[PDB]
Amino acid sequence: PIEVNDDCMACEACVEICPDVFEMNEEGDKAVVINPDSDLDCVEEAIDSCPAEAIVRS
């Protein structure tokens, strides 16, 4: 499933783009995945919009 790696911080950008695919952890200390098998371009915008490009279709 999609992964935001660990190096990621918590910009919440991907969450602000697709909070249905990527949501804040328990404390927002890391971007947690919600749709480990989405099917939208949100991943494209969630990645592009992501400067840390920690999001990958691993």
Residues in the site for ligand F3S, rule: CB under 6 A? 4, 8-14, 22, 31, 50, 52, 54-55
Q: Is 8 annotated as a binding residue?
A: yes
Q: 52 near 11, Cβ under 8 Å?
A: yes
Rounded distance, CA 57 to CA 26, Å? 23
Three-state DSSP class for 14?
A: helix
Q: Closest CB to ligand F3S among 11 and 34?
A: 11
Rounded distance, CA 57 to CA 44, Å? 10
Nearest distance from residue 13's CB to ligand F3S, in Å? 4
Q: Is 11 annotated as a binding residue?
A: no
> Which residues are known binding-site members for [3Fe-4S] cluster?
8, 14, 50
